[PDB]
Amino acid sequence: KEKINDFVRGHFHGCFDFDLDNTLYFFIAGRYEYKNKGADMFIEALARLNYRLKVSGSKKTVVAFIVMPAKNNSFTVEALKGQAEVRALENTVHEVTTSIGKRIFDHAIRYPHNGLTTELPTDLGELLKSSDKVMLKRRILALRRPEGQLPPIVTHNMVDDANDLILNKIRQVQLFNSPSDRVKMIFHPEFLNANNPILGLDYDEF
Amino acid sequence: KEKINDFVRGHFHGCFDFDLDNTLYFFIAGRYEYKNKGADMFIEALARLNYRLKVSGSKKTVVAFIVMPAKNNSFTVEALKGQAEVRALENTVHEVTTSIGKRIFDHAIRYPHNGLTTELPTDLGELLKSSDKVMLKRRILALRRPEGQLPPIVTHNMVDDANDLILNKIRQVQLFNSPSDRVKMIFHPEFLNANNPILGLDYDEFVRGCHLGVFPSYYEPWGYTPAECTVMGVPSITTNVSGFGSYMEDLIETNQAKDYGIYIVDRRFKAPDESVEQLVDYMEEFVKKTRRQRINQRNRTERLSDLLD
Amino acid sequence: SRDLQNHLLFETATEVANRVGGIYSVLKSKAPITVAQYKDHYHLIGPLNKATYQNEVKPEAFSDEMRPVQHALQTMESRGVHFVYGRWLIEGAPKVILFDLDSVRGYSNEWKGDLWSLVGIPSPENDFETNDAILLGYTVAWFLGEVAHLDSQHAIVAHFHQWLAGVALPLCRKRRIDVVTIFTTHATLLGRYLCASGDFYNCLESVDVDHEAGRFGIYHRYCIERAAAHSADVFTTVSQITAFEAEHLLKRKPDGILPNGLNVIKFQAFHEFQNLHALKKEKINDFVRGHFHGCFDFDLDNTLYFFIAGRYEYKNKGADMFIEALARLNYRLKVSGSKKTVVAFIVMPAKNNSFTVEALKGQAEVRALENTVHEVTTSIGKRIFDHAIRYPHNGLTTELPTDLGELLKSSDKVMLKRRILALRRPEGQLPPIVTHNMVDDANDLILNKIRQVQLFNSPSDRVKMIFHPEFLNANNPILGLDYDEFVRGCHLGVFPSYYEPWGYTPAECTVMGVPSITTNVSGFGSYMEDLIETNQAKDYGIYIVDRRFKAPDESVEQLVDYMEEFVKKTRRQRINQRNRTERLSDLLDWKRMGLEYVKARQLALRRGYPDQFRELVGEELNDSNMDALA
Ligand SMILES: O=c1ccn([C@@H]2O[C@H](COP(=O)(O)OP(=O)(O)O[C@H]3O[C@H](CO)[C@H](O)[C@H](O)[C@H]3O)[C@@H](O)[C@H]2O)c(=O)[nH]1
Ligand SMILES: O=c1ccn([C@@H]2O[C@H](COP(=O)(O)OP(=O)(O)O[C@H]3O[C@H](CO)[C@H](O)[C@H](O)[C@H]3O)[C@@H](O)[C@H]2O)c(=O)[nH]1
Ligand SMILES: O=c1ccn([C@@H]2O[C@H](COP(=O)(O)OP(=O)(O)O[C@H]3O[C@H](CO)[C@H](O)[C@H](O)[C@H]3O)[C@@H](O)[C@H]2O)c(=O)[nH]1
Ligand SMILES: O=P(O)(O)OC[C@H]1O[C@H](O)[C@H](O)[C@@H](O)[C@@H]1O
């Protein structure tokens, strides 16, 4: 589930208004038989489940996956690019916390001398400096989404996007991952695998 | 130098009141001959330097190492235990900052949503929790040292402490590492090694980490100790009655040679109490140097190593 | 009347509180050295950019001796003129005076009329910009008259940058305002325009200045530039090649050069710049592994990183030569059996739709391998450790493991192999020559040139092409470097320019210890070929290609010659050459290039008050140049 959470954090970069500790992951998977496998019901049922959860004022979120292989031209740039921009933040944060560590450790080993009245630092400014902030802000701006763009409902470029049953059905019931929706949709038109650069999980792990 | 800094932090746990970024590492080394190798003069000179700095009001700090093997029963528990207590803290800090990361990270990626009005956390309480603050304080507590205890002048338990010359000389000049002393004193009666559990540097590595070798010998046919120093771009103070000292006095004009890291004290044509003041002059000069200066001097000292090939 | 030892300085340009062009960065970086000399006697002047100025910008306001500046500001207020006073928020904190041109346009037709008779300059009012150039030039001379009038202690210097600011120069000359003037032109008008087609440097001695200016239809601007250069007590350019250029095309030899320095950020240790190089070289190495994923047949340790960067001017910046030359070098290197490799970067912004999937995906797959390795190596760690500590018990005869199968298990071998296969690229696919999706790929000039010389990053090629049509930035998810960080990590900048009045590209490059190849028709190349003998300058990291007294094809062959030279170097040799280049940086710091700005100002006071300067120094020194003076 941590590897999924990681994928999701990328996916909703810029539009991430919910709590993964209070988030659930439904999926459907298999051969793309829209009608026999019941993708139709699934999508419809989810659209309604969304309405119920909104009405009840629940704070939970459902991120719902469709793993049915359809013809595609691999991943989208937007998928790969935001998963990269989220790692960029992860890393800059790790660097910054290394610096904070030095600053804490100096205070801890220098107490009680040099006028260090408290055992630990108290002001955040003692630990976090302009150079540190500037990085973090730049990495944050990189995650900003455009004017009103919503997280996508598909991870790939589809061959025949306009005729795709699953996608037309999601568009029809209007699950577009706008913030208010407590049900999110992610169609991944490709069997899962560990080499997958955006959700590196063999199916069995996912 | 970092590896020496980790040792010193250990050694001074509790009584740590100076900045290692404005601290210099002098050392004397080799076969324990109190009189011949110049340890008498060294320790005295340092006590006089300690006076000069307090007087002149210097922000600097000197940690003077003595590496001369002597009869001993291995390390003190207090050196060995303090090393562990300083690492306990290093590893508690590393855990806390991880927690801090996760929080900073969550804020960044969530902003501007969920009522987050600033791009970064502003108040420290968002990052640093009580559970985190408790483990840290406990680690700090373990570094406290007893009422009026000071950092030791010895890293080992001596066989015959009460009669050892080096230890008695230090006690006599009254360098007990109190916070008001600008010169500290760490006698390590054992040849340095990488497997040393308090200071895990081979001798050559330690040399590089230090700032200034001081080998003010009285008898010394050659003196590899300052020669090795000089090969590693480390300024050394030696004497004209040493072989190496005499040789470098031939090759270079004695006032040039200070810019080239080879300080030469006069122990042939001067009173022993004038020798000591010249050795103190040279140390007080080096302490006055900026980092610009030390680095440049170190490059000159390095470039000089061709002559010793 | 006036004092020359304590004088005022009023620097005036278009680009004060707004980064419209190169001139921005000159004034900005120079401000620290010019504040430090003058303190409160220095004042920058320009037009108030209502939009962006919000970013960058009482009896207490001035001292007693600098009260005359305060009184003259109130006299501009007494005819209604709105003006922003303050500090410019950059190193040095110089004081700015930003005139509102919206609150002086009611004079426009009168003032454009005045120019018909005072100098004779037409003003087609369908030219949005020359209007603003005239409004500033009159508003500033309306101010400099009042300060010369209200201050009778100091001498006064008024420096103007580029033709747009210098409408005020004829007005200071004709009206006989009591200030000494300096004009500095960073590029001639005709020069930029004549270089459109292409042979500028040979056949500019004979060109009809008025017929040519008239044919491009920019005669009304040319007039303002020509007027400015003649009017001023001192006329200057930013480089010798531009001085040559300015002599024939503006009809006045300059009194000297004001070459553009940089605010050189120094380190406490000199050798720090060198450690950075290797750090940032590793970030590029990370990129290059991702790029060649699957076709990775060379040793990055024995690999060099050439680059060109800047505005996308295919001809002027010399991308044409760079690519042609790189193709020829590839032949040489193959012929000569060299084992080295060159990855050449072109960093010139072109219209794109961000990165390719292949680019992002490739470096994602390389990170997956990085991490699966990291998992496997901890397992190996655990096994080495357990053999170590258990020795010599349980039958362990050797101190350490000797069979790899002891440390690397099936489970570990499988996931490494899977990661390997993921990097495998389609049969006969090569590494791309572009990181992005181009909007108009088939018509991109760089990509046509590259396709034509057939640098396609096949494994036999010792020169690889990477066109990255976008300025470098830290946030970039494939090559996460700010431009400065990338430069440092590279080994050789190559900026074989044709029209380039200065070129900060190679100067920046040199500041950060990186050798460049520039040309003798660039302003920076002129200035170094004067300061250093040209064969010696190669040892200090300044390779200068002759694009003036050589055929285009010989220039190319010289550029190839120089690269081949640089490739041949050993690592010691590159490291030192880099050290020599870094030592050179002080010549480009404002702590030296700002002395030439004083020489211009000492010559302005010499011609302006010949008797007063004679008596304040001793005799009268030579009058003709900046260089001929004290
Ligand atoms: O990312 C994924 C997702 C699913 N799977 C695998 O794919 C299978 C999904 O099964 P299908 O959707 O292919 O359909 P079934 O195999 O359940 O059933 C099919 O095969 C049966 C026996 O051949 C019948 O013939 C039946 O009519 C036909 O629907 C699962 O076992 C699962 O392990 C993956 O490997 N990777
Ligand atoms: O922690 C340490 C410190 C030093 N050393 C090494 O051991 C040497 C110790 O030097 P000494 O104190 O033994 O002095 P020298 O070897 O410079 O000279 C000595 O050896 C000479 C030749 O035998 C003469 O006898 C002379 O009187 C005597 O001073 C150093 O050079 C260094 O190489 C270590 O291995 N570990
Ligand atoms: O990835 C990059 C690459 C370059 N740069 C910067 O972009 C500049 C490149 O400048 P250009 O090549 O666009 O041109 P110049 O700054 O040399 O000069 C420009 O301004 C001059 C005077 O205003 C002339 O008009 C000239 O013709 C015009 O190109 C460099 O300073 C460099 O710092 C980046 O920030 N990121
Ligand atoms: O010039 P290069 O071949 O990139 O190598 C250059 C060198 O850079 C710096 O000097 C580093 O300290 C060395 O680690 C490296 O050997």
Give yes or no for a contact between C502 and C316, defined as CB atoms under 8 angstroms apart.
Answer: no
Give yes or no for a contact between C160 and C12, defined as CB atoms under 8 angstroms apart.
Answer: yes
Ligand 2, closest atom to CA B67?
1
Q: Is the dihedral of CA C469, C470, C471, C473 positive or negative?
A: negative
B49–chain A Cβ distance below 8 A for any pair = no
Ligand 1: residue whose CA is nearest its atom 12: A30
Query: Which residue carries 């002393």 as its tokens?
Result: B181
Ligand 2: residue whose CA is nearest its atom 25: B221
Token pair recorded at residue C426:
């389609």
Contacts of A101-107 with C-beta under 8 Å, sequence gap 24+, read: A101/B93, A101/B94, A101/B96, A101/B97, A103/A127, A104/B93, A104/B96, A104/B97, A104/B136, A105/B89, A105/B90, A105/B93
What is the Cα–Cα distance from C341 to B40, expressed in whole angstroms?
A: 61
Q: Return the amino acid letter for B95.
A: E
Task: Give the residue among A73, B76, A120 at the shortest CA–CA distance from C437.
Answer: A73
**Cβ atoms < 10 Å from Cβ of B308:** 13
End-to-end, the C-alpha distance of chain A in Å comes to 8
The C-alpha R_g of chain A, in whole angstroms, comes to: 22
Ligand 1, closest atom to CA A30?
12
What is the Cα–Cα distance from C104 to C110, expressed in whole angstroms?
A: 12
Task: Give the residue among A11, A28, A26 at the shortest CA–CA distance from A67.
Answer: A28
Mutation target among A3, A13, A76, A80 for the C interface, most CBs of C within 10 A: A80
Give burial (CB, 10 Å; 0-12/13-18/19+) of A132. buried
Give yes or no for a contact between C163 and C130, defined as CB atoms under 8 angstroms apart.
Answer: no
What is the Cα–Cα distance from C421 to C423, expressed in whole angstroms?
A: 5
Q: What is the DSSP string of C162-200?
A: HHHHTTHHHHHHHTT-S-EEEEEESS-HHHHHHTTT--T
Give yes or no for a contact between B261 and B298, defined as CB atoms under 8 angstroms apart.
Answer: yes
**What backbone phi and psi angles, to 5 degrees, belong to C626?**
-65, -40
Binding-site entries of B for alpha-D-glucose 6-phosphate: 1, 211, 294, 298
Token pair recorded at residue B113:
């949503």
Give the mutation target among C284, C303, C571, C573 for probing the ligand 4 site: most ligand atoms within 8 A of CB.
Answer: C571
Give the mutation target among C483, C514, C519, C588 for probing the ligand 3 site: most ligand atoms within 8 A of CB.
Answer: C483
Kindly report the CA angle at C334 between C332 and C336, in degrees rounded to 5?
65
Q: What is the CATH number of the domain that holds C203?
A: 3.40.50.2000
**What backbone phi and psi angles, to 5 degrees, belong to C455?**
-75, 95
Which residue segment(s) compose the domain that C67 sits in?
3-263+591-617
Mutation target among B293, B294, B295, B300 for the C interface, most CBs of C within 10 A: B295
What is the Cα–Cα distance from C251 to C229, expressed in whole angstroms?
A: 9
**Cβ atoms < 10 Å from Cβ of C209:** 16
Q: What is the dihedral of CA C158, C159, C164, C167, to 10 degrees?
A: 30
What is the Cα–Cα distance from B235 to B259, expressed in whole angstroms?
A: 9
Give yes or no for a contact between B307 and B288, defined as CB atoms under 8 angstroms apart.
Answer: no
From chain B, pick out residues whose CB is under 8 angstroms from the CB of C268.
291-292, 295
Q: Annotate A178-202 with b (16+ C-beta within 10 A) or e (fewer).
A: eeebbbbbbbbbbebebebbbbbee
Q: Return the amino acid letter for C578.
A: R
Task: Give the residue among C190, C163, C155, C183 at the shortest CA–CA distance from C1.
Answer: C155
Q: Which element (helix H / strand E) includes C231?
A: helix C219-231
Token pair recorded at residue A97:
């916390």
Which positions ≥6 away from C610 have C-beta within 8 Å?
C620, C623
What is the Cα–Cα distance from C149 to C532, expressed in whole angstroms?
A: 46
**What backbone phi and psi angles, to 5 degrees, belong to A92?**
-55, -40
Q: Which element (helix H / strand E) includes A24?
A: strand A23-29
What is the Cα–Cα distance from A88 to A137, expressed in whole angstroms?
A: 12
What is the Cα–Cα distance from A88 to A90, expressed in whole angstroms?
A: 6
Kindly report the CA angle at C101 between C99 and C107, in degrees rounded to 5?
120
The C-alpha R_g of chain B, in whole angstroms, comes to: 23
Query: Which residue carries 């300690």 as its tokens?
Result: B50
Coil, strand or helix: which one is C318? helix
Residue C106 exposure: Cα atoms within 13 Å on the Cβ side: 6
Task: Give the residue among C225, C209, C118, C117 at the shortest CA–CA distance from C167.
Answer: C225
What is the Cα–Cα distance from C122 to C110, expressed in whole angstroms?
A: 13
Give yes or no for a contact between B53 and B182, defined as CB atoms under 8 angstroms apart.
Answer: yes
Count of H helices and E strands in chain A? 5, 5
**What backbone phi and psi angles, to 5 degrees, belong to B138?**
-60, -35
Q: Which element (helix H / strand E) includes A166?
A: helix A165-173
Closest ligand by atom to C522 CA: 3
Residues with CB under 6 A from ligand 4: C 274-275, 277-278, 281, 491, 571, 574-575
A115–chain B Cβ distance below 8 A for any pair = no
Name the minimum distance, in Å, from the CA of B127 to any CA of chain A.
Answer: 9
Q: Are strands C154-161 and C3-12 parallel, antiparallel or unpaired?
A: parallel
Token pair recorded at residue C176:
């006989």
How far does Cα A146 stand from its chain's mean position? 17
Closest ligand by atom to B68 CA: 2
What is the Cα–Cα distance from C145 to A156, expressed in whole angstroms?
A: 68
What is the Cα–Cα distance from B58 to B50, expressed in whole angstroms?
A: 10
Q: Return the amino acid letter for A196.
A: N
**Cβ atoms < 10 Å from Cβ of C207:** 14
Cross-strand partners of C44? C11, C96
Token pair recorded at residue A58:
């629940």
Q: How far is the CA of B69 from the centre of ligand 2 (A)?
A: 11
Q: Maximum CA pair distance of chain C?
A: 108
Q: Return the amino acid letter for B201.
A: L
**Cβ atoms < 10 Å from Cβ of B158:** 18
What is the Cα–Cα distance from C417 to C12, expressed in whole angstroms?
A: 65
Q: Maximum CA pair distance of chain A?
A: 75
**What backbone phi and psi angles, to 5 degrees, belong to C311?**
-55, 140
What is the Cα–Cα distance from A129 to A135, expressed in whole angstroms?
A: 10
Strand segments, DSSP code E, in C315-458 are 341-347, 352-355, 436-438
**Cβ atoms < 10 Å from Cβ of A5:** 14
Q: Which element (helix H / strand E) includes C519?
A: strand C516-519
Token pair recorded at residue C446:
């760089």
Ligand 2: residue whose CA is nearest its atom 33: B225
Note which residues in 272-291 of chain B have CB less than 8 A from chain C.
291
Contact C360 A85 (CB under 8 A): no
Which positions ≥6 away from C139 have C-beta within 8 Å?
C76, C81, C99, C101, C104
Peptide bond into B112 cis (omega under 30): yes
Name the minimum distance, in Å, from the CA of A101 to any CA of chain B.
Answer: 6
DSSP code for A197: S
DSSP code for A163: G
What is the Cα–Cα distance from C515 to C580, expressed in whole angstroms?
A: 9
Peptide bond into A112 cis (omega under 30): yes
DSSP code for C586: G
Length of chain B: 309
Cross-strand partners of C586? none
Give burial (CB, 10 Å; 0-12/13-18/19+) of B88. middle
Closest ligand by atom to C577 CA: 4
Coil, strand or helix: which one is C623? coil
**Cβ atoms < 10 Å from Cβ of C253:** 13
Give yes or no for a contact between C509 and C485, defined as CB atoms under 8 angstroms apart.
Answer: no
Token pair recorded at residue C434:
């572009």
Cross-strand partners of A161? none
Q: How far is the CA of A158 from the centre of ligand 1 (A)?
A: 22
Q: Which of B17, B90, B100 sits opposite A105 (nearest CB)?
A: B90
From chain A, pick out residues whose CB is under 8 angstroms from the CB of C481.
none
Give yes or no for a contact between C514 and C493, defined as CB atoms under 8 angstroms apart.
Answer: yes
What is the Cα–Cα distance from C139 to C73, expressed in whole angstroms?
A: 12
Ligand 4: residue whose CA is nearest its atom 8: C278
Task: Give the residue among A33, C511, C513 at the shortest CA–CA distance from C524.
Answer: C511
Coil, strand or helix: which one is A74? strand
Ligand 4, closest atom to CA C281?
4
Coil, strand or helix: which one is B156? strand
Angstrom distances, CA of residue B222 to CA of A78, B146, B216: 71, 46, 12
Contacts of B220-227 with C-beta under 8 Å, sequence gap 24+, read: B220/B36, B220/B37, B220/B244, B220/B245, B225/B29, B225/B30, B227/B308
Count of H helices and E strands in chain C? 24, 16
Task: Give the residue among C399, A104, C238 at the shortest CA–CA distance from B100.
Answer: A104
Q: Are strands C463-467 and C341-347 parallel, antiparallel or unpaired?
A: parallel
Q: Is the dihedral of CA B39, B41, B46, B51 positive or negative?
A: positive
Name the minimum distance, in Å, from the CA of B292 to any CA of chain C.
Answer: 6
Kindly report the CA angle at C581 between C580 and C585, in degrees rounded to 5?
115
Strands of the C83-87 sheet, one edge to the other: C83-87, C95-99, C42-47, C3-12, C154-161, C180-185, C234-237, C256-257
What is the Cα–Cα distance from C198 to C218, expressed in whole angstroms?
A: 19
Coil, strand or helix: which one is A149? coil
Q: Return the amino acid letter for C461.
A: D
Q: Which of A75, A87, A142 sits opposite C357 (nearest CB)?
A: A75
Q: Return the amino acid letter for C285.
A: N
Token pair recorded at residue B204:
């050559």
Task: Give the residue among B178, B237, B185 at the shortest CA–CA distance from B211.
Answer: B237
Token pair recorded at residue A199:
């959700």
Token pair recorded at residue C211:
């017929």
